[PDB]
Amino acid sequence: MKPHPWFFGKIPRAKAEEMLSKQRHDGAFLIRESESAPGDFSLSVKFGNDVQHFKVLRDGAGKYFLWVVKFNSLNELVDYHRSTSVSRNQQIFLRDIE
Amino acid sequence: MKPHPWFFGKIPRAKAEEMLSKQRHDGAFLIRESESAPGDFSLSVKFGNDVQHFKVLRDGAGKYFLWVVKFNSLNELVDYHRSTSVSRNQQIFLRDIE
């Protein structure tokens, strides 16, 4: 086993952008510990001529995530699931009843 | 504007399975109001020779969803995002730094 090459601990975002800006492949990244938000992590990623940052969010149960899809209405949930599976284990897409 | 053909209100799940089992296309579905969980909705969908049911969950903010992806560790979040975009607005996939 080897340590992960992407964990840089507490480093300034500017320092993260400086290093990642030098990487050649889009997607080159690192995880750093936020200086502004105690106990939080942020993901810094090279993409094109920029280095984007994504806060790592946590939920009540303590799980991590960058972004999830939630709906403001049943109508929107339904329409979204006509092209994204309603199931995590199988590919099932909604189609109107006849 | 026309009413949605998929909202059946409070009907027994068995009744939902009976009707959807007769549909010809996988994905034929309906939304019904759960008799067991007051105020909740469930999605019933035909798929193959079965009719599956998915509870419509709600979060603190009141938004709806069937399922979302959360991680038990940063390690898992990172690895998942090597093949699913870290961004909701662009396709950015993680690749190890050099």
Question: What kind of experiment solved this structure?
Answer: X-ray
- Nearest residue to B69 via CA among A68, A46, A34: A68
Check CB contact under 8 Å for A95 and B31. Answer: no
**B88: nearest CA partner in chain A:** A67
B97 touches chain A (CB under 8 A): yes
| Substitution target from A96, A97, A98 for chain B, most B beta carbons within 10 A | A97
Name the CATH superfamily housing domain B1-98: SH2 domain (3.30.505.10)
Q: Which residues, in sequence order, are CB contacts of B33 under 8 Å at separation 6+?
A: B9, B10, B39, B40, B41, B42
Q: Which residues, in sequence order, are CB contacts of A73 under 8 Å at separation 6+?
A: B64
Query: How many H-runs (helices) and E-runs (strands) does chain A carry?
Result: 2, 4
Distance from CA of B92 to the nearest CA of A (A): 6
- Nearest residue to A6 via CA among A38, A46, A37: A46
Can you give the residue ranges of every domain in chain B? 1-98
Check CB contact under 8 Å for B66 and A73. Answer: no
Cβ atoms of A74 and B29 closer than 8 Å: no
What CA–CA distance (Å, rounded) separates B98 from A20?
A: 10
Task: Report the length, in residues, of chain B.
Answer: 98
Cβ atoms of B80 and B69 closer than 8 Å: yes
Burial group, residue A78, by CB count within 10 angstroms (0-12, 13-18, 19+)? buried
**Chain B residues 9-68 with a CB less than 8 Å from chain A:** 19-20, 23-31, 41, 43, 45, 47, 52, 54, 56, 59, 61, 63-68
DSSP string, A78-97: HHHTTTS-S-SSS----B--
The residue written with tokens 């997607």 in the block is: A27
